[PDB]
Motif scaffolding. Structure first.
Motif, PDB file in Angstrom:
ATOM      1  N   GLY A  16      -1.387 -13.077  -7.001  1.00  0.00           N
ATOM      2  CA  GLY A  16      -1.780 -12.697  -5.575  1.00  0.00           C
ATOM      3  C   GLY A  16      -1.067 -11.503  -5.093  1.00  0.00           C
ATOM      4  N   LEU A  17       0.190 -11.727  -5.454  1.00  0.00           N
ATOM      5  CA  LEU A  17       1.120 -10.556  -4.739  1.00  0.00           C
ATOM      6  C   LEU A  17       0.769  -9.446  -5.570  1.00  0.00           C
ATOM      7  N   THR A  18       0.689  -9.477  -6.819  1.00  0.00           N
ATOM      8  CA  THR A  18       0.701  -8.329  -7.750  1.00  0.00           C
ATOM      9  C   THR A  18      -0.731  -7.693  -7.394  1.00  0.00           C
ATOM     10  N   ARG A  19      -1.810  -8.182  -7.331  1.00  0.00           N
ATOM     11  CA  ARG A  19      -3.031  -7.878  -7.029  1.00  0.00           C
ATOM     12  C   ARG A  19      -3.029  -6.812  -5.882  1.00  0.00           C
ATOM     13  N   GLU A  20      -2.381  -7.686  -4.813  1.00  0.00           N
ATOM     14  CA  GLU A  20      -2.453  -6.889  -3.579  1.00  0.00           C
ATOM     15  C   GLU A  20      -1.332  -5.636  -3.462  1.00  0.00           C
ATOM     16  N   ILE A  29       7.720  -1.357  -2.378  1.00  0.00           N
ATOM     17  CA  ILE A  29       7.035  -2.656  -2.883  1.00  0.00           C
ATOM     18  C   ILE A  29       7.876  -3.711  -2.242  1.00  0.00           C
ATOM     19  N   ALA A  30       9.073  -3.644  -2.238  1.00  0.00           N
ATOM     20  CA  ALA A  30       9.838  -4.882  -1.542  1.00  0.00           C
ATOM     21  C   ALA A  30       9.378  -5.231  -0.393  1.00  0.00           C
ATOM     22  N   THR A  31       9.383  -4.487   0.462  1.00  0.00           N
ATOM     23  CA  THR A  31       9.243  -4.564   1.778  1.00  0.00           C
ATOM     24  C   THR A  31       7.634  -5.066   2.001  1.00  0.00           C
ATOM     25  N   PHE A  32       6.775  -4.454   1.158  1.00  0.00           N
ATOM     26  CA  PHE A  32       5.157  -4.959   1.075  1.00  0.00           C
ATOM     27  C   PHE A  32       5.282  -6.512   0.632  1.00  0.00           C
ATOM     28  N   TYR A  36       3.701  -9.724   2.585  1.00  0.00           N
ATOM     29  CA  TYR A  36       2.788 -10.233   1.947  1.00  0.00           C
ATOM     30  C   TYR A  36       2.958 -11.995   2.001  1.00  0.00           C
ATOM     31  N   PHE A  37       4.231 -12.456   1.730  1.00  0.00           N
ATOM     32  CA  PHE A  37       4.473 -13.781   1.754  1.00  0.00           C
ATOM     33  C   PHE A  37       4.475 -14.278   3.307  1.00  0.00           C
ATOM     34  N   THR A  38       5.063 -13.263   4.115  1.00  0.00           N
ATOM     35  CA  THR A  38       4.960 -13.788   5.572  1.00  0.00           C
ATOM     36  C   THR A  38       3.428 -14.085   5.850  1.00  0.00           C
TER      37      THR A  38
END
Length: 66
Positions: A16-20, A29-32, A36-38
């Motif tokens: 899910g992370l990867t696709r987003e 990417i790390a900020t994203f 994402y998890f938040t």
């Protein structure tokens, strides 16, 4: 080369992370990923799917008249 075994469902979590990440192409990417998890956690909370913490305060309330 890394080959690891992971808990059932963690593959989907990473997917899910990867696709987003692929959909958005974030410059950072790390900020994203932190966002994402938040946001995924907020969605889980709103759905009522946060894990029950049975040692924690029973802070919600249920009412029904008779």
């Amino acid at each position: 080369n890394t080959h690891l075994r992971i808990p059932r469902g963690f593959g989907n979590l990473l997917e899910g992370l990867t696709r987003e990440v692929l959909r958005e192409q974030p410059e950072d990417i790390a900020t994203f990923a932190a966002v994402y998890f938040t946001e995924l956690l907020k969605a889980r909370e709103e759905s009522g799917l946060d894990p029950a913490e049975w040692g924690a305060k029973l802070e919600d309330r249920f009412y029904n008249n008779h």
